[PDB]
Subunit: 258 residues, 4 copies
C-alpha cells in the first residue's frame, strides 16, 4: 500500500520519519507522496494541518495518522515510542470527522475546506459584516472578526473565543465572535452558535469590502469579496485508528492533566 | 380530537382560553385533560414548561402548542391575535425536539425528563463533584454547580452561563459550569461541553452527598445521592407547527430585535 | 507584646502552632487571645478569614500574619519552614488592605466587614433586585446573585465570576453578576463594575424580600430585608510584612506557575 | 478666551459648529485653533478622540467639551439642543480623567498618550509576548493581542474584551487579553488586571519583533520593537463641566436604556 510521511523538519521528526520509512521497507509498502493511501504526519498539530491541506483533493482515498514529537496533539495523538508498533499495524478501522466548507464569492467563486476553522477579520480596526442564516438576516456584527469551527476545531481558536467543545461525531459547525461592540446602537447575539448540516451562514460586507480570510493555518487577504458562505461539508477526513483514545480523554489530557 | 388548554391564570390568558374552548366547540373537538392529543399552553415559557411536565408520561401521544400572552417565547411562539386562526387549523405537520434524561441514584433510582435543563447545586457554598464521561474520570469540579441543557434549553439558563446556542435538530446535550474555582490546586475545563446521543455524563459526590437538583422549573433537595447521570433521551417532545418560524429567527426576535 | 495563634486544627498546623508558642516563650511575648496585637493564622486562606472575623472589632490594634501549611495562600503567604525565622522577627513594617462595608437594613440595621467579598443570592431559583448607585437606579437584575469584592478578594469568588484582579493598593470594590438573564425584556450591564471610595451601591428587593447574604465564609438567610448597601470601608486590615512578596507575584505563583 | 471647534464634517455637525461660532462672536471669545483654552468637539466619540490627539501637547491648558450629533457619547455627552445654552456658560468647574502613558522602545524611544486605550496585535496569526510587571516576569502570552485601557476607556474596547468598567476617578489602567491560547503548554492569567499608578507593565517580544500598536484611533506598525511599556500618566485630560451627568448614569444611558 502506498504511503507518505510529512515531517515537522526538526532533527527528532526527520529521524523518526527516516526510521519509519526503513520499517515500512520491510513490508509490502510503497512510498508514494503523489497518490498515498496512508499519510503519516510527524510533528504537532500544525504539521498535521499542513498534511491535510497537502492532500485535501484526495481526502476520500486517504487515512491520516499523526505522531507528536512534542506534547500530545488532538490530531497528532500517537507517541514516537510507538512508531515501530504503528508500522506493523499499518501493514485497522477508520474514523471520520466532519469538515467545514467555505465559499468565497467575488464580483468568480472559490471554495476551501477547513479541518479546524475559517475566520474573517478586518483590514484594520473593527469591520462590519451582515450575518445571514438560511437567507434570513440575523445580525449586523461590528468588531474584530468571526470564527467558524469544525467539531475537532472546537478545542483550538474556537475554545479561546469562549466556544463550546463539541464531540466530533456531531455533524455541525460553530460560530464565535471576536470582540463585538454592543451598545444602544450595535447588537450581536454574543453567544457561540452551533449549526447542523445543510444550514448556510453567509457573511456580507456593509461598507469596506476587503477582509482577511483564514482557513486553518493559511491566511489570505481577499479583495472585492461579496460574500463568505459557511456550511458543513459533505466531505470528511478519515483517520486510521488502531486503539481507543476517546476524544474526551484527549481533551482531559491536553487541558486538565497528564 | 381530544385537546386541553392550560392557562397562566391571569385575566388575559384565562379569557383567551375560554374563547378558544368556545371555538373548538364548533368543531369535532372534545375537551379532555386526562388523555389529550393536543395540549395548548397560554402564557409564557414557564406555563409551557408546566404543560410539558403535566403530560410528560404521554409525550408520544401529544402535540404541544404555545401561545404567548406577553412577549415572544421560544416555546410559546404564537400570538393571541391568531387564536381563532389556530382553532381552525387544529381541526398539520409535527416537529420534534430532543429531551434530556436525568437519572438520580441513591443508596433506589429515579428518572426525570427535562425540556430545558437539569442542574445540580450545593447545599451551601461551593460543592465538589467528580465528573465522569463514559466511565472516564474527566475532572473534579469545585464551585457553584453544573447545568446540562437540551438544544431548545440552550437559549435559557445555558445561555446565561456562557453556553452555545444549538439548533434543536441536533440530538445533543450541553454541560456548562457555574463559577468554578481554578487555581494551582483545582482545575476544570471551563468551556461548555457538547455531547452526542449515547454519551453518558455522571456526576458523583466527593465529601458532601446532599445536593439541590433541578429539572426545568422544579427544584428538589436530594439526600444520599450517589450519582446523577445525564444522557440524551430516546423520548422527544412533538410540536404542532402550522407555519414556518425558524429557530434562528426566534433567537433573533428574542435577543437581537423585534 | 501580646500575640495569639489560630490553627486550622490538623496535625501539621497544631504542631507548628505549639512549636511557635515555644519559640515566643523565649522572648518578651505574652500569649493573649483576648487582646492580641499580633494574630498569626496557621492553615490556609479559610483559616485566615476566620482569624480576621474573630478579631474584626479590634482591627486597628492588630497586625495579621498567615502561614500556609498547604499550598501558597494570598493571605497565608508564609511557609512553615520560616516559622522559627518569623518568631525572631516579630520580637517590621505594616501593610494595609481595603475592606468592604456591608449594611443590611430591615423593617433595624446591621453592618458587616468583609475581607474577600459579600454576596447576595436567592431563596431559590432566580431572584430580582434593583441596583441603585449613588441614589440613581442603574439596573434591574434577574439571575442567581451578585458579588461585591474587595481588592484582595478579587482573586477569589470575583475571579471565578469573570471579575478583574485589582491591586490591593487601590481603594475600591468590584461588583460582578452571577448568571444574569438578558433578553428583550431583561437587561443588565453584564460587565464587572469597579467603584471608588464614597460610592454607595444599594440592592433592593422587587417581589421576594428574603435573601441569602454571605460575608466571607459566613452565609446567613436574612428575612424582611429592605436593602443591602455596599461601600468601601473606612477600616483597613493591617499585615505585618517582613519581606517583599509582591501581590502580582502572589498572583503569578497561585494561578500561573510555581 | 480662545476656543476652537472641531466637527465630524457631516452637514449637521458643520452647521452646528458655524452656529456656535456665531454665538461666541457675541461674547469676548476669540476663535483660535493654535492656542485654544476651550476645545469643543461636535460629532461622536471618534471626533472627540481626534480633538484630544490634535491638542495632546497642550492638555493642561485646555478644557474639552463634547457635543453628540448622534447618540449619547461617553465623551460627547452634550445634546445639540443645548448648544446655545453652552455658549452662554463658556463665556464653570473642571473635571479631570486619567490617561495612559505608552512608551515604545526600539534598537530610540517614543511616548504616546491614550485617552481610551493602547493595544498590541500581531503581524499575522497569534504572536508571543512576555509580560513583565514591575520588572517581574508575570506570564508568556500567546494569542491575538493585549489591550491596556484607561478608566474612561473601560467602556470601549476593554468592555468588549470582558474587562471591568472602572469609575474614572480611580487612577489606574486595566489590561485585557484578546483570545489567549491556554493548554498544557501555554498559560495566561485570563482575567483582566487592574494596575495603580507607578506600576509599570512591560511587553517584550519572544521571536517575531514586529507588532501593530494602536493608541486610541491610530494604528501603526512598529518595526524592531524591543519593548512596549505602560504606566498611568502623570498628565490628565480636563473637561469643562456645567451640570451633573454622573459616569454611572452615562453607562446606564449607553448600555441599559435611554
Ligand atoms: C499554524 C499554527 C498557528 N496553528 C497550528 C495548530 C493547531 C491546533 N489545532 C488544535 C486543535 N484542533 N485542538 C487543540 N489545539 C490545537 N492546536 C494548537 O493550537 C496552538 C497554536 O497553533 C498549538 O498549541 C497547537 O497545537 C494554527 C491554529 O492556531 C489556532 N489559533 C490561531 N490563533 C489562535 C488564538 N489566538 N488562540 C487560539 N488558537 C489560535 C487555530 O485553530 C489555527 O488553526
Ligand atoms: C419557572 C421560571 C424560573 N422559568 C420558566 C422559563 C423559561 C424559559 N425557557 C426559555 C428558553 N427555552 N429559551 C429562552 N428563554 C427561556 N425562558 C425564559 O427564562 C426567563 C426566566 O424564566 C424568562 O424570560 C423565560 O421566558 C424557569 C427557567 O429559568 C431558567 N433560569 C433559571 N435561572 C436562571 C438564570 N439565573 N439565568 C437564566 N435562566 C435561568 C431555566 O431555563 C429554568 O428552566
Ligand atoms: C470557607 C471557604 C469556602 N473559603 C475560604 C477561602 C478563600 C480564598 N480566599 C482567596 C483569595 N483572597 N484569593 C485567592 N484565593 C482565595 N481563596 C481560595 O478559595 C478556594 C475556596 O475556598 C480555596 O482555594 C481558597 O484558598 C471561602 C471563599 O470561597 C470563595 N468562594 C466561594 N464560592 C466560590 C466559587 N464558586 N468560586 C470561587 N470562589 C468561591 C470566596 O472568596 C469565599 O470567601
Ligand atoms: C475610530 C473608531 C474605531 N473609534 C472611535 C471611538 C470610540 C469610543 N470610545 C468609547 C468610550 N470611551 N466608551 C464607550 N464607547 C466608546 N466608543 C464607541 O466605540 C464604537 C466604535 O468606535 C462607537 O460606538 C464609539 O462611539 C475607536 C475606538 O474603537 C474601540 N474599538 C476598536 N475596536 C473595537 C472592538 N472590536 N470592540 C469594541 N471597541 C473597539 C476603541 O476604544 C478604539 O479607541
Amino acid at each position: 500500500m502506498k504511503y507518505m510521511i510529512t515531517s515537522k523538519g526538526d532533527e527528532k521528526s526527520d529521524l523518526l520519519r527516516l526510521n519509519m520509512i526503513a520499517g515500512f521497507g520491510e513490508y509490502d509498502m510503497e512510498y508514494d507522496d503523489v497518490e498515498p493511501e496512508i499519510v503519516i504526519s510527524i510533528g504537532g498539530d500544525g504539521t498535521f494541518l499542513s498534511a491535510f491541506h497537502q492532500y485535501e483533493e484526495r481526502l476520500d482515498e486517504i487515512a491520516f495518522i499523526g505522531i507528536h514529537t512534542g506534547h500530545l496533539g488532538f490530531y497528532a495523538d500517537w507517541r514516537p515510542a510507538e512508531a515501530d508498533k504503528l508500522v506493523k499495524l499499518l501493514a485497522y478501522q477508520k474514523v471520520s470527522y466532519p469538515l467545514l466548507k467555505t465559499t468565497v464569492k467575488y464580483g468568480k467563486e472559490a471554495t476551501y475546506l477547513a479541518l479546524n476553522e475559517s475566520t474573517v477579520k478586518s483590514s484594520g480596526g473593527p469591520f462590519v459584516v451582515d450575518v445571514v442564516i438560511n437567507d434570513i438576516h440575523f445580525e449586523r456584527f461590528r468588531g474584530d472578526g468571526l470564527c467558524m469551527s469544525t467539531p475537532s476545531g472546537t478545542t483550538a481558536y474556537n475554545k479561546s473565543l469562549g466556544g463550546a467543545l463539541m464531540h466530533p461525531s456531531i455533524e455541525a459547525m460553530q460560530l464565535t465572535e471576536m470582540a463585538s461592540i454592543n451598545n444602544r446602537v450595535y447588537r450581536t447575539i454574543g453567544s457561540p452558535l452551533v449549526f447542523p448540516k445543510h444550514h448556510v451562514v453567509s457573511l456580507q460586507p456593509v461598507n469596506d469590502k476587503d477582509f482577511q480570510i483564514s482557513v486553518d493555518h493559511l491566511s489570505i487577504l481577499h479583495r472585492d469579496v461579496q460574500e463568505i458562505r459557511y456550511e458543513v461539508s459533505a466531505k470528511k477526513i478519515h483517520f486510521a485508528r488502531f486503539r481507543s483514545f476517546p476524544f474526551w480523554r484527549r481533551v482531559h489530557d491536553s487541558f486538565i492533566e497528564d
